[PDB]
């Protein structure tokens, strides 16, 4: 008798960066997915392991919501068994993932004529991320035989890069807001159920 706060995840003013992707926990509520259905035609709406039509008839223990902003031609990397800069260094989904991925264009909100440099992503790491793992460190990355002791220079680079969204870019370089829902069911009693 509480209703789940889906509109706070989707209608939020500010979305987080890729390398800090803002997990939220939802439990002990009635989940109404009609609001997700009625939303304007999405650039992507894919579910894994569960049919989209069979929501509102399933019960789960917890529902996690992760939100971040990526560019247009990186949306295809938010999927099980995918490889790329975003999948390897920023956000990794398990191969046996059960959930849904929603993405929509946000050019009117996250783009500035001079350039929006508030969104960053990681472009350097020694090893690939495990599923559902975050890395917010800002240490200098070593690519040579000589250490740099925290000073940038040759063969020593900062591991983060900005997007610089501008309104005149093409669809493949425009901002996109992505929400991934992870459905977890365990031996505990169910807490999230549909109407």
């Amino acid at each position, epitope marked *: 008798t*509480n*209703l789940c*706060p889906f509109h*706070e995840v989707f*209608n*939020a*003013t*500010t979305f987080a960066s890729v390398y800090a992707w803002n997990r939220k926990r939802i439990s002990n509520c009635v989940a109404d997915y009609s609001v997700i259905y009625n939303f304007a035609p999405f650039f992507a709406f894919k579910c894994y392991g569960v049919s989209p039509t069979k929501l509102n008839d399933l019960c789960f223990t917890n529902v996690y919501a992760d939100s971040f902003v990526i560019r247009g031609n990186e949306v295809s990397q938010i999927a099980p068994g995918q490889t790329g800069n975003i999948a390897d260094y920023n956000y990794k989904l398990p191969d046996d993932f059960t959930g849904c991925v929603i993405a929509w264009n946000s050019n009117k909100l996250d783009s*500035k004529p001079s350039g929006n440099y508030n969104y960053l992503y990681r472009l350097f790491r020694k090893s690939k991320l495990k599923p559902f793992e975050r890395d917010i460190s800002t240490e200098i990355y070593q690519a040579g035989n000589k250490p740099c002791n925290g000073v940038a220079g040759p063969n020593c680079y900062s591991p983060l890069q900005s997007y610089g969204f501008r309104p005149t870019y093409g669809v493949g370089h425009q901002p996109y807001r992505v929400v991934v829902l992870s459905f977890e069911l365990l031996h505990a009693p169910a807490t999230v159920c549909g109407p």
Partner: antibody
Amino acid sequence: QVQLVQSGAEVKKPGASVKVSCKASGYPFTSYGISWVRQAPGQGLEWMGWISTYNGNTNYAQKFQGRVTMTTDTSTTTGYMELRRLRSDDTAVYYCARDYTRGAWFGESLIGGFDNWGQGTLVTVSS
Amino acid sequence: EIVLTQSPGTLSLSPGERATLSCRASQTVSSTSLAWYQQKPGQAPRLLIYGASSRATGIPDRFSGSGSGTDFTLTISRLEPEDFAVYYCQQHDTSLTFGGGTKVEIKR
């Protein structure tokens, strides 16, 4: 069919306190917060505070930091505001509005405004 | 805190004309944290525009909004007799504040 109904007009004296009510019907009460705004006679709108109907978190304006308290009752779907140490310049019409600016569960900004308003309660402070 | 200035205070226009209202901020305000309100005399305010470009429920197509950064505008294409009221702008990018208010009158 969202409606908010407030209490009637009150006339008080300086130094006292007044409690204004606001009853809501037609929507899930715990999914939205409540914000309070007052308008002095022949003046503009000024913000007072915000309360969450899900966990009781509050966020007041600095001008009313130590005088105003806000409470909600889920059983009767009613919000309350109390203003202590009433002054001569607190005569205004007090409004109650459903909120779409701060989230009730997590407490973060949303895209919207005050979507629904009450009818207003006039408070008069004079000796 | 951020202070909003509305100009002009009064805007005398004839019915059927177009209206332009200005809301300016001392700092930069995100386009997703601006709104407009309408208040007819002896009545409670109502929401018109949220997000600086989106109309609310049951709002005609006459009202439109556009702007970015520290300059925002509200446009009324045609002035019906029930559109003569006081208009306010507000933001919640940093705390929550209201503007002074602009009054639209009838010219004769």
